[PDB]
Write a protein that holds these residues in place. Structure first.
Motif, PDB file in Angstrom:
ATOM      1  N   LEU A   1       0.796  11.568   3.390  1.00 37.18           N
ATOM      2  CA  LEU A   1       0.421  12.088   4.696  1.00 37.18           C
ATOM      3  C   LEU A   1       0.710  13.581   4.805  1.00 37.18           C
ATOM      4  CD1 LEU A   1       2.761  10.419   7.389  1.00 37.18           C
ATOM      5  CD2 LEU A   1       3.225  10.270   4.983  1.00 37.18           C
TER       6      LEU A   1
ATOM      7  N   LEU B   1      -0.375  28.834   4.527  1.00 37.78           N
ATOM      8  CA  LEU B   1      -1.505  29.709   4.783  1.00 37.78           C
ATOM      9  C   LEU B   1      -1.619  30.762   3.686  1.00 37.78           C
ATOM     10  CD1 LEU B   1      -1.215  30.285   8.636  1.00 37.78           C
ATOM     11  CD2 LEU B   1      -2.496  28.551   7.426  1.00 37.78           C
TER      12      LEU B   1
ATOM     13  N   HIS C   1       0.366  17.503   6.844  1.00 38.27           N
ATOM     14  CA  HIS C   1       0.588  18.179   8.121  1.00 38.27           C
ATOM     15  C   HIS C   1       0.086  19.613   8.023  1.00 38.27           C
ATOM     16  CE1 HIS C   1       2.669  19.267  11.887  1.00 38.27           C
ATOM     17  NE2 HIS C   1       3.091  20.343  11.249  1.00 38.27           N
TER      18      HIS C   1
ATOM     19  N   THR D   1       0.843  -1.189   0.000  1.00 36.44           N
ATOM     20  CA  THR D   1       0.000   0.000   0.000  1.00 36.44           C
ATOM     21  C   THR D   1       0.877   1.237   0.000  1.00 36.44           C
ATOM     22  OG1 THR D   1      -0.159   0.356   2.395  1.00 36.44           O
ATOM     23  CG2 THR D   1      -1.707  -1.211   1.424  1.00 36.44           C
TER      24      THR D   1
ATOM     25  N   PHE E   1       6.546  -4.195   0.382  1.00 40.78           N
ATOM     26  CA  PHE E   1       6.849  -2.966   1.098  1.00 40.78           C
ATOM     27  C   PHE E   1       5.721  -1.961   0.943  1.00 40.78           C
ATOM     28  CE2 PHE E   1       8.901  -3.062  -3.002  1.00 40.78           C
ATOM     29  CZ  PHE E   1       8.331  -1.990  -3.621  1.00 40.78           C
ATOM     30  N   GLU E   2       5.604  -1.090   1.933  1.00 43.14           N
ATOM     31  CA  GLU E   2       4.776   0.100   1.854  1.00 43.14           C
ATOM     32  C   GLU E   2       5.627   1.263   1.370  1.00 43.14           C
ATOM     33  OE1 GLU E   2       2.866   0.535   5.694  1.00 43.14           O
ATOM     34  OE2 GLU E   2       1.433  -1.022   5.132  1.00 43.14           O
ATOM     35  N   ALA E   3       4.999   2.203   0.684  1.00 48.63           N
ATOM     36  CA  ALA E   3       5.698   3.370   0.173  1.00 48.63           C
ATOM     37  C   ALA E   3       5.058   4.627   0.725  1.00 48.63           C
ATOM     38  CB  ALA E   3       5.682   3.417  -1.352  1.00 48.63           C
ATOM     39  N   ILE E   4       5.895   5.568   1.141  1.00 43.93           N
ATOM     40  CA  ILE E   4       5.460   6.922   1.447  1.00 43.93           C
ATOM     41  C   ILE E   4       5.784   7.764   0.221  1.00 43.93           C
ATOM     42  CG2 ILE E   4       5.952   8.958   2.828  1.00 43.93           C
ATOM     43  CD1 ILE E   4       6.337   7.041   5.217  1.00 43.93           C
ATOM     44  N   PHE E   5       4.754   8.115  -0.547  1.00 39.15           N
ATOM     45  CA  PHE E   5       4.967   8.808  -1.808  1.00 39.15           C
ATOM     46  C   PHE E   5       5.308  10.273  -1.606  1.00 39.15           C
ATOM     47  CE2 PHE E   5       2.373   5.358  -3.785  1.00 39.15           C
ATOM     48  CZ  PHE E   5       3.354   4.927  -4.646  1.00 39.15           C
ATOM     49  N   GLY E   6       4.768  10.900  -0.571  1.00 38.34           N
ATOM     50  CA  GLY E   6       5.087  12.284  -0.304  1.00 38.34           C
ATOM     51  C   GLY E   6       4.593  12.721   1.053  1.00 38.34           C
ATOM     52  N   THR E   7       5.232  13.733   1.627  1.00 37.80           N
ATOM     53  CA  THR E   7       4.792  14.335   2.875  1.00 37.80           C
ATOM     54  C   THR E   7       4.539  15.808   2.622  1.00 37.80           C
ATOM     55  OG1 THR E   7       7.046  14.782   3.614  1.00 37.80           O
ATOM     56  CG2 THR E   7       6.068  12.678   4.242  1.00 37.80           C
ATOM     57  N   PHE E   8       3.367  16.276   3.017  1.00 39.31           N
ATOM     58  CA  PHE E   8       2.872  17.567   2.586  1.00 39.31           C
ATOM     59  C   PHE E   8       2.536  18.420   3.797  1.00 39.31           C
ATOM     60  CE2 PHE E   8       2.018  14.648  -0.834  1.00 39.31           C
ATOM     61  CZ  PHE E   8       2.470  15.340  -1.922  1.00 39.31           C
ATOM     62  N   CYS E   9       2.703  19.727   3.643  1.00 39.98           N
ATOM     63  CA  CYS E   9       2.271  20.681   4.649  1.00 39.98           C
ATOM     64  C   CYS E   9       1.561  21.822   3.949  1.00 39.98           C
ATOM     65  CB  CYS E   9       3.439  21.220   5.490  1.00 39.98           C
ATOM     66  SG  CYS E   9       4.717  22.098   4.588  1.00 39.98           S
ATOM     67  N   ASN E  10       0.637  22.452   4.658  1.00 37.40           N
ATOM     68  CA  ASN E  10      -0.146  23.525   4.075  1.00 37.40           C
ATOM     69  C   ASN E  10       0.582  24.853   4.217  1.00 37.40           C
ATOM     70  OD1 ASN E  10      -0.689  24.290   6.852  1.00 37.40           O
ATOM     71  ND2 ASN E  10      -2.503  25.340   6.074  1.00 37.40           N
TER      72      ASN E  10
END
Lengths: 49, 49
Positions: free
Chosen positions: A43, B12, A45, A39, B1-10
């Motif tokens: 994610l 403002l 933040h 999967t 395996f699991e994959a973390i494709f991206g980590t995002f922050c907003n």
């Protein structure tokens, strides 16, 4: 006395995913280790104003 | 395996007071002795045709 006069093939109509309008909705990517991936996760933040 | 494709922050939507249309209705002044000011007033004098 019989005679055959004709041997005809129906022309196959070909469709391709990338040329369709529906592909606009997609971000199409090739990844050759898909059978190993279980999967994929993304994610986020966010801190509110 | 699991994959973390991206980590995002907003990010403002930064909104300053003087970069808004509501600021058109305001005459905005900065005053450093404000905390000393109890009450400010204006006086008008009118004579009639």
């Amino acid at each position: 006395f019989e005679a055959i006069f004709g041997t005809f093939c129906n022309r196959l109509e070909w469709v391709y995913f990338l040329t369709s309008g529906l592909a606009a909705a997609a971000h199409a990517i090739k990844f050759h280790d898909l059978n190993k991936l279980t999967t994929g996760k993304m994610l986020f933040h966010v801190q509110v104003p």
